[PDB]
Curated annotation (Swiss-Prot), chain A:
Species this chain originates from: Saccharomyces cerevisiae (strain ATCC 204508 / S288c) (Baker's yeast)
Subunit structure: Component of the GINS complex which is a heterotetramer composed of SLD5, PSF1, PSF2 and PSF3. Interacts with PSF2.
Localisation per UniProt entry: Nucleus
Protein name as it appears in the record: DNA replication complex GINS protein SLD5
Gene that this sequence comes from: SLD5
Residues of the full protein shown: 75 to 147 of 294
Top-level taxon in the UniProt lineage: Eukaryota
Described purpose of this protein according to its UniProt entry: Required for DNA replication. Functions as part of the GINS complex which plays an essential role in the initiation of DNA replication by binding to DNA replication origins and facilitating the assembly of the DNA replication machinery.
UniProtKB/Swiss-Prot annotation, chain B:
Name of the protein described by the UniProt record: DNA replication complex GINS protein PSF1
Subunit record text: Component of the GINS complex which is a heterotetramer of SLD5, PSF1, PSF2 and PSF3. Interacts with PSF2.
Major localization listed first in the record, in broad terms: nucleus
Keyword annotations: Cell cycle, DNA replication, Nucleus
Miscellaneous comment text of the record: Present with 1431 molecules/cell in log phase SD medium.
Subcellular location: Nucleus
UniProt source species: Saccharomyces cerevisiae (strain ATCC 204508 / S288c) (Baker's yeast)
Full-sequence range covered: 105 to 208 of 208
Curated annotation (Swiss-Prot), chain C:
Listed transmembrane segments: none
Protein name, entry field: DNA polymerase alpha-binding protein
Function: Accessory factor for DNA replication. It plays a role in accurately duplicating the genome in vivo.
Disulphides: none
Compartments reported by the entry: Nucleus
Other noteworthy facts: Present with 3280 molecules/cell in log phase SD medium.
WD repeat segments: 219-259
Section of the entire sequence shown: 474 to 927 of 927
Highest rank taxon of the organism: Eukaryota
Swiss-Prot record, chain D:
A biological-process GO annotation: double-strand break repair via break-induced replication
Natural source organism: Saccharomyces cerevisiae (strain ATCC 204508 / S288c) (Baker's yeast)
Gene Ontology MF terms: chromatin binding; DNA replication origin binding; single-stranded DNA binding
PANTHER family per record: CDC45-RELATED PROTEIN, CELL DIVISION CONTROL PROTEIN 45 HOMOLOG
Keyword tRNA-binding: no
Record's protein name: Cell division control protein 45
Length: 63, 104, 424, 553, 181
């Protein structure tokens, strides 16, 4: 049977998934303008948000 | 539910596409309702596909049976006929379900 | 005595046609023999930092040393040397070292600003990074070399007296000597084992410098020796902070095999890097072994007492004595390093705070055992070794629980004496 | 001028972003060595983590419709062996735009005639000039160098003749036949060794491409007999056998034969291509179909233990041929059989050498599938190319044998008609060459794709590989399957019976410029390799009349 | 609306909950990681352990600038003592690493050519232990009571494999027991 939707924590991180998407939004663009080096810190940040974004994608569909 | 020219639910079972044409208004009332569920989310989360979890970040993909220029967003990939790619992960999800790229 | 060519962390040929020329924290250099020449292949652990390369050996070099800027090669028979930098900006240079009748080059060394070449007759020829000679010195015959930055550390061994070591610094003004041929306490040795003894007459497996400025040596006796306080000759002594036999015995369960040796690679502030070699030979061959890390342990145990109390396990009470000896040596060296050289990584204060807390905590376990056996006098001497002021407060509570009111007042006299000295 | 480590780091920083900064490489499918060079370059770009785009192009006229129409911010174009002869900068206009230019291609041309503009006067064409040719026409330091800038009535008159003196040395040059002097396997593998990446798969890969040129030339890989030897010893994985390891891909050496694909199978269909070897001696059918029956049916060839006898205890018989042909050595002296060769294994799954391995790649590239038919013919060869490129994994096993069983009928197909055109006796030595026109036979469909045609010539150049102590000239064939008489006519090379002293490359491409320059009356050079052109039916007869008098050798 | 695999997990996400556990590495390289669960370090020092999450280290191995240490029970001299405590105990399984089967399969793709002689030994010493578990599971389900079971030490994988049938047999027999009264 259905369980109570814990809305309080969800919106608390739903702000967070907006923020780091905007954090990488500028800092890539700052890396393009400084390009006339390290390709580590971009790729990890790109995959980490969407994996958490993947989890709630299933989580609301089963509702 | 809308990934590439949604309202073309044509070229699809014409002998029963008049059958479910009485059900199309039922069908499109899912489709209209599924649009506002895509927009009524306060942030942009995909609800169109991508159900299998991702594993890696670099995937070799080949193409066939397709032509033209598509993918105006996220950088144009310039799809020529029968020519493979080697790209990142999140881009091809809207094209594999579209059915243009073929093999992972 | 026969003067054999020595190399840092080198392995002999054995029954094969390939061996390791040198081995360090940067990587390893090996050679492969073919039909008409030799082939030098250089592989690294950090593939992402430097570019792996290889070349054919037409001259037949048998000596090699590796540092963070280049690779130096040397021929013991013809005296021809060659330095190859990893960058394409610097050009290669070749020069022939003059050698007399019966003279063979035994050990080489390289730094980015100076080149050190040692021979069997004791000729000390030093070059710069371009090949220009500076001075020619006549000293004792050098059999082993190691260097980090400026320092030159040579092990000397003559025909009659032998077994000595020197320590120097190649400064901008003049060459300064800190030690002038002091005796080495390394133990000499009294088929894999037979063939290794001929190629390596002194049994020196490997030698390198630590990351905190102290010279380390690893002889045939498998005891890690640490030279502490090398800047002052009044308090310079060797410290055996690690014993091989004790570490293998405790981790395995309480047994002791023969085919599992410990080859040293590097020491970077917490553990000794090693390669687990399993087999009959004491030297590794070609598979790619994974690097392991062994926790540092003081060799203080009994053998009959461990069998009666039973991977072999050590109890609480017995481990408090070993923890006290390990923490006392490490805290003294870390304190003198920061007050003279400063920080190197930026996190030395958190390591020092955690080490000093575990030092006072381990002493309280021995302090509690002395109160249980009614030895009030032994408990008095243990209270003076505490450093932190909060440890003295905890000693009062252990004394009151053990019903010793006279021991309580003795702790307070130590507290009043330290406060008076602090205000002077 | 291009040091090998430098271009790699230079092309690294130019496109290493996580966007559409896409560098794209081009490759022909009409050559086997063209493939294997590219495959090893791709995988290191994977582990150097860069985005890419690979497109094959089969036709030289197709290059405009694949590049010059679809470009947005491609700064780094890459290409494998296309423009050693025709200048692409005249073929494709690129105006100078933004000295430190905005888009720079490289080139990996493997051919002998070069183009002076492409090395000297380089501004977008950064060619691979390192220690390849140190004598890049070393007399050129005053010919074009005075052609660039070009009482004076007697002084300039001499100066025009010096230009005319420079004109002749640019006239005899740019008038040579072509080959490949050094394989593209040789260059990039040497480049990676300057970087220093140790994988035996690379060492398995680079030797494949140079093995492909064993049937086109001789002394090119005869220089590489040391460079095969040192690397397999310097990259020694093991001194012991260290047996029963399913992995680790051990590398060895074992002798092997011109009689081919034996370790895969068929000492049965060896009987045909043993007679190929006797076609190298003095016959094609007659004496051999007696003569083979001293050396072969000595053992009846079984059904079950022939999985074991011509797999395993043929080592008693390879020894026996080894102790047969040692006494056929001072007496027969025919040294087309014993060869050093190279082999590999997989731990299990049989021993597979590289001699037969290039054979499967050729046939599997062939089969395995107005102006409306050529489009649906050109879409085939790109597609069936693609299923050969992924043949270099372990993941293809039960498709690997598919080409194998395909190969041992295609030769049985090609020999079925070669014996016909001999017995028809339609080879005519007119004066210079010999001409043969396969007007019509059976099974004409397997002659559209040109990779079979060089093999048919490779069988046909060896029927005339007897003594022939005058007129060592190869042939020109003719065949037609499709409408309007397309006629993919081609030329061959003369051959040596293992005695190249004379400089025999080709004379036809010099004449191929001539006939194409005359009237433009439906002649085509749209196919890539210059050794193949097309002709019309009413033009092949005035073709030869222009050729029997124009003696340009 | 999946409508395909709803009552259980598919086998592609059971690895997804285990990849988010940390292990130890041997680093090599020198801002860096701001990944909301990061612990980015400074210029990192080799020859030392660090609890690092798994999935970033696999990505760190494709660019090949680090190395992995195996966990402490992944030697052949350790697994043998597991096979004796079970062969004397047919009642249940004794001692379990709890995620062992999915842990090895990730560890056999450029995480195997690092360790000291594990080929022709380790796959020997694992695939035996898979069936010995599942031989034990066949005797257990024959002993099925009503509404009370004893599974003490099971991997997550068999739990994803016993699952979609063990429900509806005992559920369908739950009807005939309960609807009888």
């Amino acid at each position: 049977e259905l369980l109570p939707y814990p809305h309080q924590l969800m919106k608390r991180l739903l702000n967070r998934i907006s923020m780091q998407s905007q954090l990488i939004e500028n800092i890539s663009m700052g890396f393009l303008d400084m390009q006339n080096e390290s390709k580590l810190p971009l790729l990890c940040m790109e995959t980490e948000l969407e994996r958490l974004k993947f989890v709630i994608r299933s989580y609301i569909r089963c509702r | 539910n809308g990934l590439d020219l949604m309202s073309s639910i044509t070229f699809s079972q014409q002998d029963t596409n008049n059958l479910s044409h009485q059900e199309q208004e039922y069908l499109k009332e899912y489709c209209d309702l599924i649009t506002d569920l895509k927009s009524g989310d306060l942030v942009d989360i995909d609800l169109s596909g991508s159900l299998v979890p991702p594993s890696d970040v670099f995937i070799d993909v080949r193409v066939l049976k397709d032509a033209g220029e598509i993918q105006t967003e996220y950088g144009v990939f310039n799809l020529i006929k029968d020519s493979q790619f080697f790209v990142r992960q999140s881009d091809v999800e809207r094209l594999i379900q579209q059915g243009y790229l073929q093999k992972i | 005595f026969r003067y054999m060519p020595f190399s840092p962390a080198g392995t002999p040929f054995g029954f094969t046609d390939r061996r390791y020329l040198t081995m360090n924290e940067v990587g390893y250099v090996s050679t492969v023999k073919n039909s008409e020449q030799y082939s030098i292949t250089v592989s690294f652990f950090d593939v992402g930092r430097f570019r792996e390369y290889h070349f054919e050996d037409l001259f037949g070099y048998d000596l090699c040393f590796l540092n963070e800027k280049g690779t130096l090669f040397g021929q013991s028979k013809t005296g021809q040397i060659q330095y190859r930098p990893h960058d394409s900006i610097h050009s290669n240079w070749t020069k022939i070292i003059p050698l007399q009748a019966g003279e063979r080059i035994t050990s080489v060394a390289a730094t980015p600003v100076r080149v050190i070449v040692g021979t069997s007759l004791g000729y000390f020829r030093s070059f710069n990074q371009f090949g220009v000679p500076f001075a020619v010195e006549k000293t004792s015959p050098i059999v082993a070399l190691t260097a980090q930055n400026y320092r030159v550390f040579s092990v000397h061994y003559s025909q009659f007296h032998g077994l000595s070591y020197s320590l120097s610094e190649l400064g901008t003004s003049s060459k300064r000597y800190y030690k002038r041929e002091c005796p080495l306490p390394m133990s000499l040795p009294n088929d894999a084992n037979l063939d290794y003894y001929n190629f390596n007459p002194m049994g020196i497996k490997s030698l390198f410098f630590s990351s905190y400025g102290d010279p380390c040596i690893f002889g045939s006796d498998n005891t890690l020796l640490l030279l502490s306080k090398w800047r002052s000759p009044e308090e310079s002594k060797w410290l055996p902070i690690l014993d091989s036999n004790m570490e293998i015995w405790k981790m395995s369960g309480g047994k002791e095999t023969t085919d599992i040796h410990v080859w040293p690679l590097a020491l970077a502030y917490d553990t000794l890097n090693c390669i687990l070699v399993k087999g009959k030979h004491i030297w590794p061959e070609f598979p790619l072994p994974l690097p392991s890390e062994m926790e540092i342990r003081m060799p203080v145990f009994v053998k009959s007492k461990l069998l009666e109390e039973n991977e072999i396990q050590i109890p609480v009470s017995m481990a408090a004595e070993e923890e006290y000896l390990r923490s006392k040596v490490l805290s003294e060296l870390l304190t003198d390093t920061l007050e003279n050289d400063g920080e190197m990584y930026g996190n030395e204060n958190e390591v020092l705070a955690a080490l000093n807390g575990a030092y006072d905590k381990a002493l309280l376990r021995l302090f509690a055992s002395a109160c249980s056996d009614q030895n009030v006098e032994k408990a008095l001497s243990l209270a003076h070794e505490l450093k932190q002021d909060r440890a003295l407060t905890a000693a009062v509570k252990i004394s009151e629980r053990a019903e010793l009111p006279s021991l309580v007042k003795k702790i307070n006299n130590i507290r009043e004496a330290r406060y008076e000295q602090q205000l002077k | 001028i291009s040091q090998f480590s430098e271009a790699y780091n230079k092309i690294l920083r130019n496109s290493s972003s996580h966007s559409s900064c896409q560098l794209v490489i081009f490759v022909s499918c009409l050559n086997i060595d063209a493939l294997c060079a590219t495959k090893m370059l791709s995988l290191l770009f994977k582990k150097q983590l860069v985005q890419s785009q690979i497109v094959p192009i089969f036709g030289y006229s197709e290059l405009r419709r694949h590049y010059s129409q679809l470009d947005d911010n491609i700064n780094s174009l890459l290409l494998v062996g296309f423009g050693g002869v025709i200048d692409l900068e005249a073929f494709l206009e690129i105006d100078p735009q933004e000295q430190s230019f905005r888009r720079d291609i490289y080139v990996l041309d493997a051919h002998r005639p070069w183009n002076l503009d492409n090395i000297f006067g380089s501004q977008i064409i950064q060619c691979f000039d390192d220690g390849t040719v140190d004598d890049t026409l070393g007399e050129q330091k005053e010919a074009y160098y005075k052609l660039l800038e070009l009482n004076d009535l007697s002084k300039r008159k001499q100066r025009k003749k010096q230009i005319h003196e420079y004109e002749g040395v640019l006239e005899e040059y740019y008038s040579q036949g072509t080959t490949v002097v050094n394989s593209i396997s040789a260059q990039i593998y040497s480049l990676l060794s300057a970087i220093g990446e140790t994988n035996l798969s690379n060492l398995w890969l680079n030797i494949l491409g140079t093995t492909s040129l064993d049937i086109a030339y001789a002394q090119v890989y005869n220089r590489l007999y040391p460079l095969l030897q040192d690397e397999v010893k310097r990259l020694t994985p093991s001194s012991r056998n260290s047996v029963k390891t399913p992995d680790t891909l051990t590398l060895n050496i074992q002798p092997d034969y011109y009689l081919f694909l034996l370790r895969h199978s068929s000492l049965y269909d060896s009987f045909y291509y043993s007679n190929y070897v006797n076609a190298k001696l003095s016959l094609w059918n007659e004496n051999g179909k007696k003569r083979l029956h001293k050396m072969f049916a000595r053992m009846g060839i079984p059904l079950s233990t022939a999985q074991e006898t011509w797999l395993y205890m043929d080592h008693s018989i390879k020894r026996e041929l080894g102790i047969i042909f040692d006494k056929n050595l001072d007496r027969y002296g025919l040294q087309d059989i014993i060869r050093d060769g190279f082999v590999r294994t997989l731990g299990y799954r049989g021993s597979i050498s590289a001699s037969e391995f290039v054979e499967a790649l050729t046939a599997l590239l062939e089969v395995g599938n107005s102006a409306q038919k050529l489009t649906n013919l050109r879409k085939r060869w790109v597609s069936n190319f693609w299923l050969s490129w992924d043949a270099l994994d372990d993941r293809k096993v039960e498709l690997l044998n598919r080409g194998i069983q395909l190969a041992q009928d295609l030769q049985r197909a090609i020999f079925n008609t070669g014996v016909a055109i001999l017995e028809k006796k339609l080879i005519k030595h007119l004066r210079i060459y010999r001409l043969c026109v396969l007007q019509d036979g059976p099974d004409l469909d397997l002659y559209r794709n040109p990779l079979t045609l060089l093999r048919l010539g490779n069988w046909l150049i060896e029927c005339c590989a007897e003594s022939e102590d005058k007129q060592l000239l190869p042939m020109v064939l003719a065949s037609i399957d499709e409408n309007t008489d397309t006629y993919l006519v081609a030329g061959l090379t003369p051959r040596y019976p293992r005695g190249t002293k004379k400089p025999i490359l080709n004379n036809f491409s010099m004449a191929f410029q001539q006939i194409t320059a005359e009237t433009d009356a439906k002649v085509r050079i749209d196919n890539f390799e210059s050794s193949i052109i097309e002709i019309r039916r009413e033009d092949l007869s005035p073709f030869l009349e222009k050729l029997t008098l124009s003696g340009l050798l | 609306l999946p409508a395909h695999l709803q009552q259980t997990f598919s086998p592609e996400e059971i690895q997804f909950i285990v990849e988010n556990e940390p292990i130890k590495i041997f680093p090599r390289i020198t801002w860096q990681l701001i990944t909301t669960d990061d612990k980015a370090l400074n210029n990192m020092v080799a020859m030392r352990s660090t609890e690092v999450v798994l999935w970033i280290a696999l990505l760190l191995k494709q660019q090949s600038k680090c190395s992995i240490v195996a966990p402490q029970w992944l030697t052949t001299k350790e697994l043998d003592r597991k096979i004796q405590y079970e062969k004397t105990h047919p009642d249940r399984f004794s001692e379990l690493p709890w995620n062992w089967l999915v842990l090895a399969r990730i560890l056999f793709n450029k995480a195997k050519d690092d360790f000291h002689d594990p080929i022709h030994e380790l796959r020997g010493k694992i695939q035996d232990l898979r069936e010995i578990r599942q031989i034990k599971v066949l005797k257990g389900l024959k002993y099925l009571n009503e509404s009370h079971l004893q599974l003490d030490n099971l991997s997550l994988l068999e739990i994803n494999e016993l699952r979609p049938f063990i429900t509806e047999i005992m559920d369908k027999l739950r009807e005939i027991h309960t609807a009888s009264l």
